Design a protein around this nucleic acid. Structure first.
Length: 197
DNA sequence: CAGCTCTGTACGTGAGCGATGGACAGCT
DNA sequence: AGCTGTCCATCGCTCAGTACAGAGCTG
């Protein structure tokens, strides 16, 4: 058998969770789908190799140096960026999650965003915004788009911004290069909000 | 018919793991 | 010269959401 987790079983990782990294007065909260096996293993956000997050964060200029998963706790203080996931349960991919889990996640998430009130709630995955939009805004569009959404988190000024998942499982944006446009537009939106305020 | 939701399926890239075998140094 | 074992370059295999077609349902 192939040992991908230094002798730790996949069964053990499936029982692990990934802590939120949230504070008040954040500019951005990156909302993932759920922990993958490596994030559950490490206890940090978006570790490699099958994930473009840290590469895109650097390539877009959101970080001035190339960071990695071990730097995740430094992001609120240094960059005004926090982290959560729609679903707590660890799985190898998003396809293993049920509709009920996603809708439970959505309820807990809107409550968290209403508490921390970041300037921008970033959905790192179209699939989770599809569910969130229907559940929270009661809206289901034929052609859901990426980028800035025309809805704020209820009872807050928090914007919703959607990006294709940073997971390299997605063949439609095969490289970190193919997703960086969305991170650049995220930086532009952040800089623009900090201009008026 | 015509919309809608639900399920099944196919899809590009770059990286860790395990297998392979050529290059080569240490020994006699 | 002949043998043997390690190193390590390199390769194949596997892995880390989204769009879309077609079935089933319903207005």
């Amino acid at each position: 058998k192939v040992d991908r987790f230094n002798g730790v079983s996949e069964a053990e990782l499936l029982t692990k969770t990934l802590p939120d990294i949230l504070t008040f007065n954040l500019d951005i909260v990156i909302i993932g789908i759920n922990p993958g096996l490596m994030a559950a293993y490490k206890g940090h956000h978006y570790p490699g190799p099958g994930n473009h997050f840290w590469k895109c964060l650097f390539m877009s200029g959101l970080s001035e140096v190339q960071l990695n998963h071990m730097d995740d706790h430094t992001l609120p203080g240094k960059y005004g960026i926090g982290f959560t996931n729609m679903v707590e349960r660890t799985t190898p991919g998003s396809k293993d999650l049920s509709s009920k889990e996603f809708r439970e996640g959505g309820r807990i998430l809107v409550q968290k965003l209403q508490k921390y009130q970041p300037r921008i709630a970033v959905f790192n995955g179209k699939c989770i915004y599809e569910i969130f939009s229907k559940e929270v805004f009661g809206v289901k569009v034929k052609n859901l788009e990426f980028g800035l959404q025309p809805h704020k988190i209820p009872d807050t000024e928090t914007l919703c911004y959607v990006m294709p998942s940073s997971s390299a499982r997605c063949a439609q944006f095969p490289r970190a290069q193919d997703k960086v446009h969305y991170y650049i537009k995220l930086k532009d939106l952040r800089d623009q909000l900090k201009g008026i305020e």
